[PDB]
Amino acid sequence: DVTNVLLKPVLTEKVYFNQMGETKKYVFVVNPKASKTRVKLAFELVYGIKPLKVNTLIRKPTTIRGGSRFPGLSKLEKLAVITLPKGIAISVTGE
């Protein structure tokens, strides 16, 4: 509802491999506390096309910048894979 559970879309080789061939699959990063239903609701209120299904990924924090004078940890990411129906392809940028 508040639509703070859609932080940033991410574009990688896996993402672009999916974003072709009839059904498109768009991968965003979402609030780690959000649920699948909240992700679908956010997509409903801000895009307008009902996802066919939603898959979720949790990327665990790991050590980064190892050996550097001050080492630091990573940030917890939850990934969401929206899949729109046949024949529909909306743009992530431009509204």
């Binding site: 991410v10 574009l11 990688t12 080789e13 672009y16």
Partner: peptide, 30 residues
């Protein structure tokens, strides 16, 4: 031609060389 020249190296954030997008190479490195 020009798009062939602009696909060599110049690796984008999430990618490597070779499979550079055929149409999207003017956004990050503009």
């Amino acid at each position: 031609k020009q798009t062939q020249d602009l696909t060599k190296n110049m690796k984008i954030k999430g990618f490597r060389k070779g499979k550079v997008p055929p149409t999207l190479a003017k956004d990050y490195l503009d």
